[PDB]
Ligand binder design. Structure first.
Ligand SMILES: COc1ccc2c(c1CN1CCNCC1)O/C(=C\c1c[nH]c3cnccc13)C2=O
Length: 270
């Protein structure tokens, strides 16, 4: 009615995502159907309405501009919720991008990683923990060179105490989760960021099995500068408290002289 539904973009047990167009202005959107009986975590709006937590989280971060995909609207159905999400065009997710082009040049990896950090910082500042940071949940606006974080379906309100639930991606999950089913938000995020950064510069993730994660030894399969290797190994410290803060990551020498998004697009995407 209010949207022209296009092709399916992806699906899972959570539900399904379609490309779409808002009739009123031809604005590109994504349409996410979320099955009610597969929602683990429910939240509340002021009005008291139960909604998926993702709706709560998205509202907390969809204020203003950011590298987070914005929730434009949402609807309730008898057995599902429907989320209307911002859709840049043309886009490609980071997983497909790395698949097509292999390991990224460090200058490009630096630009992308920096934008992800800024997006994650925005989330934390808004009281939101994403909990599933990975290449598939990152969209690249190919024209503007801007990255967007998506899928807060595994996320949670940020807190300073321990989390005992996790339904994000295992190979991006920290050793303390694998072992003790316990983690703290920021340090677990930093671990996933380490996995992400390795993924960008090596063209694949560093760990496949639980035992490799808890061993935490990083082998580099591509030529990577010593500074980048150092940042990666720091983010992947076995002890959570040994991991850097976001500020320490962004002040790391490897992170200096980041390209602007449009510069990034001009050199690397055009
Ligand atoms: C299994 O597929 C899923 C699952 C969850 C979400 C999702 C997709 C579809 N793609 C996403 C990219 N990686 C491959 C799978 O998309 C989302 C949000 C979106 C907001 N705006 C957009 C624009 N284009 C595509 C997507 C979205 C989601 O939460």
């Amino acid at each position: 009615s209010q949207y022209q539904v296009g092709p399916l973009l992806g699906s899972g047990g959570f539900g399904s995502v379609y490309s779409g167009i808002r009739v009123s202005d031809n604005l590109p959107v994504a349409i996410k159907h979320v099955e009610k009986d597969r929602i683990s975590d429910w939240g509340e709006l002021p009005n008291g309405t139960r909604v998926p937590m993702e709706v709560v989280l998205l509202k907390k971060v969809s204020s203003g501009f950011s590298g987070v995909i914005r929730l434009l609207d949402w609807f309730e159905r008898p057995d599902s919720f429907v989320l209307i999400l911002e859709r840049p065009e043309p886009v490609q997710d980071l997983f497909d991008f790395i698949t097509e082009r292999g390991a990224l040049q460090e200058e490009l990896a630096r630009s992308f990683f920096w934008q992800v950090l800024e997006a994650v910082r925005h989330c934390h500042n808004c009281g939101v923990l994403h909990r599933d940071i990975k290449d598939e949940n990152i969209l690249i606006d190919l024209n503007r060179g801007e990255l967007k974080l998506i899928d807060f379906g595994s996320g949670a309100l940020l807190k300073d105490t321990v989390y005992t639930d996790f339904d994000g991606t295992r190979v991006y999950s920290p050793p303390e989760w694998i072992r003790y089913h316990r983690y703290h938000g920021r340090s677990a995020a930093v671990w996933s960021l380490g996995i992400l950064l390795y993924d960008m510069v090596c063209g694949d993730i560093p760990f496949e099995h639980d035992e490799e994660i808890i061993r935490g030894q990083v082998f580099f399969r591509q030529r990577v500068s010593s500074e980048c290797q150092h940042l990666i190994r720091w983010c992947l410290a076995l002890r959570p408290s040994d991991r850097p803060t976001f500020e320490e990551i962004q002040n790391h020498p490897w992170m200096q002289d980041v390209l602007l998004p449009q510069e990034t697009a001009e050199i690397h995407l055009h």
